[PDB]
């Protein structure tokens, strides 16, 4: 039978930004049917979109990097993408290499660089890269090419070589898919859904290192499942008996029910909630599988 | 009965530094019984040392930061450690908060900062932090207090607040435990072992973003198990029947055996190898559980 890992949400890894899960909530004021490409897996272990098995791949990419200096722009990096295991990136039935960011804004990335200009020879260099929207850098990760740059008074004298770019911070974050193919079509995991009337998406929330105004809120990003649940479905071989699983999220010490929900076999969780504003949950419970249930199974309201 | 997640090593997360597993090897020329504090778990699910469940916690820490400028030194950060889920850190029966680095050298770290200066008000600031050895900064992560600094001509005018430090790079890496308690003793997970005569540690290897001279090798760091194995044992409630599990590492495609090994129930893997130099293995195989075997089970030589 299908089971779940015995891990409290607060001890889990986020599936869209490489950080701890800090929050668990529903918020029907937010887009109901997001088209996230990471954190997407079927109960049967079928990965959707750019979803990787390893949490360390999330919001990262690998590449053959080529550097040039262009006065008035600065140091420009052209990244020829490969998959993070070093295997060749081949345009296929998904938007980008596995783990490639699935949100918009400007990412500060860090890469191992080698310089000939004298000081440290191997070091780590920060670049700025626009994920989206369009009318910026004409990114084409679908075709294996993306662009980043940083202000420099003169050439950094960087040597061409292999990098794995990892995320430092987000500026002008927006939760809409990035520019995957310079305005052209790409294969996308479908919008999350559908939901019964009165059902809403359960969100696993983390907070992103940001560049913002002195008074900004923590920058929230949500996913359908923590990364441990993603790898669990992918590294297991479950047999799907019905459209959904009834889960009960319970206090770990007492067994007190906090809420019941449905894991649709397409990899998203619904609660029955009729309020208009956000409702948060303790992050120190455990999800238990109760039973296969049909699509139309009516949950106890929260 | 015990099973393992069906994941090739090359698609797994490293358990001591937050990066992909790139290499799988034995090397008798290296320390035989390393005292690693991260990536330590029992087959029965007991976490050892500072080992976190989440890969995002590895080589990171959370703290209340207090910053000061000191003419001649630069900006100084005093970090009062918390556990990475935001709960209080209390000195107990391990060296440090969960996921604290278990190696030595100077770690460049990144933290969310807030400044009152003009320009970016929330931004990410890089600091340099000595992990070890002792005779440097008098670090006491065991007691909940560590120090970092960065060169500045003037005060960075940083506001005190909560941070999660994540690693940018390593300088002067050395794979020995860091300064946990200002040169004093701390509770430690024991050395990895023991091995029968002829048995050697299987190493899962990644490479660290580094600061070095032009002609440095990639900076290798080894762990006993990938993080997906660590969370798998911790999230399962496996009954231990004898000292070791016989595993077979097989070519996914051809079904060919590459080697057999013992997963000792104390959370490390042994091969029988009598060479004196390193022997690397393909990273695209699958580990399968054959059975429970006694301590004295004799592996076929590799």
């Amino acid at each position, epitope marked *: 039978m299908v089971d779940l890992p015995v891990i409290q949400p607060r001890l889990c890894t986020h599936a869209r930004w490489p950080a701890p899960v800090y929050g668990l909530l529903v918020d029907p004021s937010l887009p109901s049917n997001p088209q996230w490409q990471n954190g997407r897996v079927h109960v049967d272990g079928t990965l959707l979109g750019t979803t990787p098995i390893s949490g360390s791949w999330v919001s990262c990419f690998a590449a053959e990097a080529a550097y040039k200096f262009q006065s*008035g*722009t*600065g140091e*420009v990096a052209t990244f020829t993408l490969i998959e993070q295991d070093g295997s060749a990136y081949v345009p296929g039935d998904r938007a980008a290499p596995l783990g490639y960011p699935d949100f*918009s*804004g*400007q990412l500060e990335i860090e890469v191992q660089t080698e310089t000939t200009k004298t000081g440290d020879k191997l070091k780590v260099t920060t670049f*700025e*890269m*626009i994920l*989206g*929207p369009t*009318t*910026n*850098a*004409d990114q084409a990760p679908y075709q294996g090419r993306v*662009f*980043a*740059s*940083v*202000t420099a008074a003169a050439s950094l004298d960087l040597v061409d070589g292999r990098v794995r770019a990892v995320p430092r911070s987000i*500026y*002008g974050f*927006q939760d809409t898919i990035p520019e995957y193919n310079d305005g052209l079509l790409v294969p996308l995991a479908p919008p999350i859904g559908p939901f019964l009337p009165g059902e809403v998406l359960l969100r696993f929330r983390t907070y992103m290192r940001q*560049i*913002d*105004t002195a008074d*900004a809120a923590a920058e929230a990003i949500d996913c359908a499942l923590p990364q441990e649940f993603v790898s669990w479905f992918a590294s297991n071989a479950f047999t799907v008996q019905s459209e959904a699983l009834l889960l009960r999220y319970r206090n770990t010490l007492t067994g007190q029910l906090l809420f019941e929900c449905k894991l649709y076999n397409e990899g998203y969780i619904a609660l029955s909630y009729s309020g208009s504003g956000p409702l948060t949950f303790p992050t120190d419970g455990i999800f238990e599988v109760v039973s296969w249930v049909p699509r139309l199974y009516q949950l106890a309201s929260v | 009965m015990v099973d393992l997640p069906v994941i090739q090593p090359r698609l797994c997360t490293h358990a001591r530094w937050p990066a992909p597993v790139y290499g799988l090897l034995v090397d008798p020329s290296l320390p035989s019984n390393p005292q690693w504090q991260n990536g330590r778990v029992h087959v029965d699910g007991t976490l050892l040392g500072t080992t976190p469940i989440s890969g995002s916690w590895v080589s990171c820490f959370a703290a209340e930061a207090a910053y000061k400028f000191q003419s001649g030194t630069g900006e100084v950060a005093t970090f009062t450690l918390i556990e990475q889920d935001g709960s209080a850190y209390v000195p107990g029966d391990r060296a440090a908060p969960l996921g604290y680095p278990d190696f030595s050298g100077q770690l460049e770290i990144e933290v969310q900062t807030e400044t009152t200066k003009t*320009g*970016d008000k929330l931004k990410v600031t890089t600091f340099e932090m000595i992990l070890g050895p002792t005779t440097n900064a008098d670090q006491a992560p065991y007691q909940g207090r560590v120090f970092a600094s960065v060169t500045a001509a003037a005060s960075l005018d940083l506001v005190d607040g909560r941070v999660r430090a994540v690693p940018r790079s390593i300088y002067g890496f050395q794979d020995t435990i860091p300064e946990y308690n200002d040169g004093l003793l701390v509770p430690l997970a024991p050395p990895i072992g023991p091995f029968l005569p002829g048995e050697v540690l299987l190493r899962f290897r990644t490479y660290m973003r580094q600061i070095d001279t032009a002609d440095a090798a990639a900076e290798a760091i080894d762990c006993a198990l990938p993080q997906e194995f660590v969370s798998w044992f911790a999230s399962n409630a496996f009954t231990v029947q004898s000292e070791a599990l016989l595993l077979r590492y097989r070519n996914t495609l051809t079904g060919q055996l590459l080697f057999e090994c013992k997963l000792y129930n104390e959370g490390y893997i042994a091969l029988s190898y009598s060479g004196s130099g390193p022997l690397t293995f393909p990273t695209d195989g699958i580990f399968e559980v054959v059975s429970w075997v006694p301590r004295l089970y004799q592996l076929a030589s590799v």
Partner: nanobody
Amino acid sequence: QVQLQESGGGLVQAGGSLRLSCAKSGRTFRAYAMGWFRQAPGKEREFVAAIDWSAAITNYADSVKGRFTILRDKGMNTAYLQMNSLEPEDTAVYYCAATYSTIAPRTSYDFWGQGTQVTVS
């Protein structure tokens, strides 16, 4: 190459309204502020208003605060200057400019539009 195309200048009476707009075209390689400068005859190019790439930060010249509003969509290539309560002292060529930045700077812009004449009675 970065080009900035302006619309919406011309002649207006004292106390009236105009809306300038500016469209950035050409490939850029990181975030950029959009801004308005102006030059009256015999005077230097002076700062009017600017908005960061995220569209969350605005700076204004003291002489226009409360009268002018700069608008922009997050990450997008079009900026608008809503100019209300215009006065003769506001007569100038208005220049759209853009510059690589994560803020809304008042100086040292790299990219320049053609200028549009604004004339108040």
